Amino acid sequence: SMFLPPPECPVFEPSWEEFADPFAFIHKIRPIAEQTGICKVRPPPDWQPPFACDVDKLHFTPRIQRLNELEAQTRVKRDYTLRTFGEMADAFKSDYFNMPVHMVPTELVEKEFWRLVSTIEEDVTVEYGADIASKEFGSGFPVRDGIKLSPEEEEYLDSGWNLNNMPVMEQSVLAHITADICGMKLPWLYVGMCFSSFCWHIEDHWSYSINYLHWGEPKTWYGVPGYAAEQLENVMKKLAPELFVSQPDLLHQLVTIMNPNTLMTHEVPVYRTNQCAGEFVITFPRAYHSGFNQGFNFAEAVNFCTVDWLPLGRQCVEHYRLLHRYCVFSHDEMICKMASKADVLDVVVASTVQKDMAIMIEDEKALRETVRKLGVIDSERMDFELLPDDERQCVKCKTTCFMSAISCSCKPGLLVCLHHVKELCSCPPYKYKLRYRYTLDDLYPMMNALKLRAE
Numbered sequence: 190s191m192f193l194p195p196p197e198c199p200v201f202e203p204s205w206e207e208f209a210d211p212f213a214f215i216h217k218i219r220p221i222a223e224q225t226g227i228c229k230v231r232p233p234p235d236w237q238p239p240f241a242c243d244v245d246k247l248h249f250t251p252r253i254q255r256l257n258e259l260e261a262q263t264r265v266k267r268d269y270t271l272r273t274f275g276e277m278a279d280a281f282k283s284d285y286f287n288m289p290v291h292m293v294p295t296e297l298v299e300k301e302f303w304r305l306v307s308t309i310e311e312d313v314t315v316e317y318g319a320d321i322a323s324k325e326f327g328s329g330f331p332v333r334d335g336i337k338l339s340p341e342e343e344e345y346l347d348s349g350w351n352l353n354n355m356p357v358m359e360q361s362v363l364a365h366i367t368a369d370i371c372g373m374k375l376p377w378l379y380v381g382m383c384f385s386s387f388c389w390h391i392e393d394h395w396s397y398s399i400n401y402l403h404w405g406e407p408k409t410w411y412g413v414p415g416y417a418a419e420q421l422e423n424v425m426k427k428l429a430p431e432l433f434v435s436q437p438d439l440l441h442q443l444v445t446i447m448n449p450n451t452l453m454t455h456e457v458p459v460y461r462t463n464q465c466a467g468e469f470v471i472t473f474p475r476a477y478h479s480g481f482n483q484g485f486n487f488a489e490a491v492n493f494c495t496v497d498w499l500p501l502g503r504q505c506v507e508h509y510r511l512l513h514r515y516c517v518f519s520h521d522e523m524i525c526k527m528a529s530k531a532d533v534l535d536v537v538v539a540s541t542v543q544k545d546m547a548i549m550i551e552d553e554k555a556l557r558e559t560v561r562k563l564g565v566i567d568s569e570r571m572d573f574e575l576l577p578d579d580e581r582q583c584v585k586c587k588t589t590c591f592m593s594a595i596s597c598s599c600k601p602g603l604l605v606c607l608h609h610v611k612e613l614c615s616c617p618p619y620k621y622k623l624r625y626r627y628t629l630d631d632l633y634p635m636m637n638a639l640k641l642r643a644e
């Protein structure tokens with residue numbers, strides 16, 4: 190009546206043979222799971238990564254969170270010990286419900302969450318932990334350290350489902366990427382409590398994400414399939430226009446809490462699940478998702494990109510361009526980097542990169558012809574990858590340049606991508622320079638190397 194729980198998302202229970210290769214399994218479940226945006230994965234019963242930590246020696250700075258529906262929160266992120274946070278968290282929930290913490294039904298917490306975030310009179314604030322793996326935090330999974338690991342810990346060091354290993358495996362396209370994008374290859378750690386929430390969002394560059402709940406009380410998820418993303422955005426734009434005004438950078442992007450029933454009322458397909466300890470949740474490209482924690486828990490998450498994602502990654506950067514949204518990295522730079530490493534690429538990877546590069550080259554070919562007809566004649570090679578990101582963004586659309594850009598001596602340091610030549614300055618195009626990374630004659634052999642590797 191008040192709150193109608195969305196239908197359950199798919200739950201997979203792979204055999205050991207299926208589970209062995211994470212990328213093969215994800216590709217297998219993709220036709221099913223991409224229709225729901227999110228899915229849950231229960232590992233084989235004996236796949237049990239050991240969790241060991243001193244609750245007194247793990248410190249982290251908590252972030253404070255107000256729980257109001259449609260209220261703006263920043264998309265990106267005192268001092269607790271893990272023990273003191275746990276004691277705070279446990280006391281909060283038990284006091285909130287006047288019940289032993291482990292006796293509060295998950296359906297009730299869900300019901301109550303959507304009540305309190307909607308009620309203006311309620312002024313509930315909670316805290317959470319969200320941080321990259323550091324020497325003060327550290328992954329929940331076993332990692333190699335100079336100290337001595339137990340045989341059980343060594344058993345899960347090179348596991349495909351050890352979230353530290355996923356970004357650097359052969360079937361992932363971020364295996365040989367150079368530029369430091371710490372947010373997209375390093376796992377994040379999340380310490381949650383009752384009602385602590387993550388707002389509606391999609392991952393950077395429409396990448397996958399995989400989440401593992403190491404221990405604690407469940408994490409409640411809501412998911413929307415990739416094909417319904419723009420439908421969701423139109424709904425939220427009409428109800429919360431503040432989230433759609435342009436921002437100075439990525440650190441200022443706004444997100445919010447919204448009842449899934451509101452989305453469902455506007456015919457947006459929403460699915461739910463309760464992620465329990467020891468279970469994986471996987472989010473698919475452009476799959477909007479949000480949720481909250483049932484109680485004190487500890488989760489670890491990392492982004493990743495498969496060969497299936499590559500053409501979507503290009504579409505995303507194009508979408509970023511239309512929105513004047515900042516990139517985390519240059520998609521074209523990634524592609525050309527992989528091309529320069531063709532001989533050591535996985536053969537299926539090489540084949541997929543080849544296809545994307547062909548599109549890249551033909552688009553670049555047309556763009557350069559266009560700007561030449563605009564009067565830009567002079568040109569010089571430029572190593573874009575050497576520039577800091579904020580020193581090679583298009584003035585107009587904020588895209589990260591790599592293949593090419595336009596410069597003018599009248600605006601030293603300023604660049605525009607080839608889509609926005611008319612946005613650089615007021616001086617005539619013959620004063621401009623085409624700054625390019627590769628000639629067309631450089632690019633075709635690079636793509637040929639990929640073709641040979643793919644055979």
Ligand SMILES: O=C(O)CCNc1cc(N2CCc3ccccc3CC2)nc(-c2ccccn2)n1
Nearest residue numbers: 262263264265266319379386387388392393488
């Ligand atoms: O809660 C979990 O276990 C993970 C939920 N997923 C989150 C959680 C999360 N949090 C950090 C930022 C944030 C923003 C607003 C409210 C709460 C939080 C805490 C969780 N951030 C992100 C994020 C950020 C940037 C790009 C892509 N994803 N994803």
Ligand SMILES: [Mn+2]
Nearest residue numbers: 305306308311
């Ligand atoms: Mn409220």
Ligand SMILES: [Mn+2]
Nearest residue numbers: 390391392398
């Ligand atoms: Mn996220």
Ligand SMILES: [Zn+2]
Nearest residue numbers: 597599614616
């Ligand atoms: Zn000028």
Ligand SMILES: [Zn+2]
Nearest residue numbers: 583586606609
């Ligand atoms: Zn531009």
